[PDB]
């Protein structure tokens, strides 16, 4: 099979400049016609992949300018001046030269800014949940930058892990920040024997946390 | 216009068969080696099968003898009958005209399991501490409880992309959990309805709450 190498990650790229994603394939994909059959592609969460060019160096349709694509028949790369917020995601690159289809294993571009602080919101159980007997406490810590954070959860003054899920999104395509949920999921009685729950984060921006909290009894 | 569309992606037990079709506006199947991708959670794309224009048919070892490919040339349609399955063929499946400028459909999903389809419950994130939120407030809703993936959380028939949030759902003893949440100004909401849409396709429900303070 063609085997098509690209690395994991690429250099983070400030709004405005070049960002530029390596491949190479163990065959040359130039044909006989003349045709270099290299084709890259997009992936962002949420949508499907999105062709941006095709046969070495062809825009696909509705792809700017600010994309290209050059290479000798084995080394390719793929540029884009003036990288924008909304370019953010995986971009493989993959041959269709010939069976079997083979693909690279994805770059993901990341976009450096100014680094943000996480604006933190708890929440308590909704009584709907609670009528079930479930007890969801969430707290949101979003539009941070960088990407590293930690969340700790006190309840009654006293750190709990337990039952406590994290998700994180990947860098928004607006304003190229990070956002995480964590969730600490309880029994309603034991939710209900316990009444200062406390959500904390600590993030580069300051050496402190920033810490959110409610009385349930309130 | 041109477009490749799959159906017929669903749940299906292990061992089961399941068979998805692709139409096409534009393409004319039969001119080309057309072909079956698959993506699965973790990994780049996985090729599954081809057909040539002659009619000739080619498999990875890991599909051979379950999977069969095949082209209806006169009502342009592309089949993948697939059998014996595997939870790790669970995946998006894609139909796609790999040669030149290679085309593909949205894909249709297929998810071997022996699990049962669960609707969500949808709880709503609002501010409930002390009476006090700031120049800008966030809200959420909580969608738990549901199988399989995904589901949809629209705020505002989508006018509310207003710092939207959705985070990746959580697998946990079964079921699935995922959160969404927005920011507006606090002179907009309460005094303004805000409301999240919640649709699970996969259950035939759609679940909508208007957060109130
Ligand atoms: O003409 C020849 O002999 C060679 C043609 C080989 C060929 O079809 N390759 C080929 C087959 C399928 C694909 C699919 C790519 C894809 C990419 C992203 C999403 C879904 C599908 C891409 C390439």
């Known amino acids: 099979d063609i085997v098509m190498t690209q690395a994991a990650f690429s250099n983070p790229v400030t709004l405005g400049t070049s960002a530029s994603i390596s491949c190479r394939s163990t065959?040359?994909?130039?044909?006989?016609?003349?045709?270099?059959?290299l084709y890259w592609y997009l992936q962002k969460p949420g949508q499907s992949p999105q062709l941006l060019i095709y046969?070495?160096?062809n825009l696909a349709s509705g792809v700017p300018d600010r994309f290209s694509s050059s290479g000798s028949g084995t080394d390719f790369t793929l540029r884009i001046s003036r990288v924008e917020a909304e370019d953010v995601g995986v971009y493989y690159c993959?041959?269709?030269?010939?069976?079997?289809?083979?693909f690279g294993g994805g770059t993901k571009l990341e976009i450096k800014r100014a680094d943000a602080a996480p604006t933190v919101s708890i929440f308590p159980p909704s009584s709907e949940q609670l009528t079930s007997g479930g007890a969801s406490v969430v707290c949101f810590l979003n539009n941070f930058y960088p990407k590293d954070i930690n969340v700790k959860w006190k309840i009654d003054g006293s750190e709990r892990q337990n039952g406590v899920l994290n998700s994180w999104t990947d860098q928004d395509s607006k304003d190229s920040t990070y956002s995480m949920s964590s969730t600490l999921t309880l029994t309603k009685d034991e939710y209900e024997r316990h009444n200062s729950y406390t959500c904390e984060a600590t993030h580069k921006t300051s050496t402190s946390p920033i810490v959110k909290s409610f009385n349930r009894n309130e | 216009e041109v477009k490749l569309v799959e159906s017929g992606g669903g749940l299906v037990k292990p061992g089961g068969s399941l068979k998805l079709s692709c139409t096409a506006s534009?393409?004319?199947?039969?001119?080309?080696?057309m072909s079956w991708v698959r993506q699965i959670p973790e990994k780049r794309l996985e090729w599954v099968a081809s057909?040539?224009?002659?009619?000739?048919?080619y498999y990875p070892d890991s599909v051979k003898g379950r999977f069969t490919i095949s082209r209806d040339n006169v009502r342009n349609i592309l089949y993948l009958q697939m059998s014996s399955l595997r939870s790790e063929d669970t995946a998006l499946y894609y139909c796609?005209?790999?040669?030149?400028?290679?085309?593909w459909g949205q894909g249709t999903l297929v998810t071997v399991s022996s699990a049962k389809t669960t609707p969500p419950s949808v709880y709503p994130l609002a501010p409930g501490c002390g009476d006090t939120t700031g120049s800008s407030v966030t809200l959420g809703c909580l969608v738990k409880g549901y199988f399989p993936e995904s589901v949809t959380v629209t705020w505002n028939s989508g006018s509310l992309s207003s710092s939207v949030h959705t985070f990746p759902a959580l697998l946990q003893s079964g079921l699935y959990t995922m959160s969404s949440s927005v920011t507006v100004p606090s002179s907009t909401w309460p005094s303004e309805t805000v409301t999240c849409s919640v649709a699970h396709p996969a259950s035939s429900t759609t679940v909508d709450k208007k957060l109130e303070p």
């Open positions: 993959a041959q269709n030269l010939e069976l079997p289809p083979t």
């Open positions: 534009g393409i004319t199947f039969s001119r080309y080696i």
């Open positions: 046969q070495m160096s």
């Open positions: 057909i040539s224009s002659g009619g000739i048919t």
């Open positions: 796609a005209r790999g040669q030149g400028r290679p085309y």
């Open positions: 065959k040359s994909l130039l044909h006989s016609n003349g045709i270099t059959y």
